[PDB]
Amino acid sequence: VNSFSGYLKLTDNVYIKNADIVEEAKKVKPTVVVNAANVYLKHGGGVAGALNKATNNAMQVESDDYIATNGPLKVGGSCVLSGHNLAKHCLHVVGPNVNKGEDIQLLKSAYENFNQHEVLLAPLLSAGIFGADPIHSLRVCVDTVRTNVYLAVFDKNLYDKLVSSFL
């Protein structure tokens, strides 16, 4: 038993809710919250900008030190940093950004990072400002992640569509 509430069960291991991931993290304080990161960990907008804002920019400060030491992530890659006031840990995962011309096949590699964590609160990778089809992203999630994932979908209209079209 865990503390996630109000989710619809899609599969054995994948759950979904119409929720603001920031507000959900603040209430659950999960072990792992996933950020929709870019390779530079520049948390300007989308989910990343919202998570970083909720940390009062501490996420960005930590991220800048990480990049100064390690260089950029790979598209499809990840790193574990602090969850600050939102979670124990933040798993920064880089899905391909279609608005940058990145290969959508890298979306499966991005979701594979979730399998290193038993339970996660996460957004749909490559959705939103990353330009991928969220229905495709949900399908890849279900077909790739084997650990327990709680997906927060900000937009109510999209949430209803994802549920109603789910096979």
Ligand X SMILES: O=C(O)[C@]1(F)CN(c2ncnc3[nH]c4cc(F)ccc4c23)CC12COC2
Query: By the criterion CB under 6 A, which residues form the site for ligand X?
Result: 20-22, 46-47, 50, 123-124, 127-129, 134, 152, 154-155
Contact status, residue 63 vs residue 33, Cβ threshold 8 Å = no
- Cβ proximity to ligand X: between 47 and 79 the closer is 47
Question: Rounded CA gap, 113 and 78, in Å?
Answer: 7
For residue 142, the SS3 value is helix
Who contacts 126 (Cβ-Cβ below 8 Å, separation ≥6)? Answer: 36, 95, 96, 97, 98, 104, 107, 110, 132, 137
Closest residue by beta carbon to ligand X? 128
- Distance in Å, CB of 145 to ligand X, minimum: 16
- Distance in Å, CB of 94 to ligand X, minimum: 14
- Distance in Å, CB of 106 to ligand X, minimum: 16
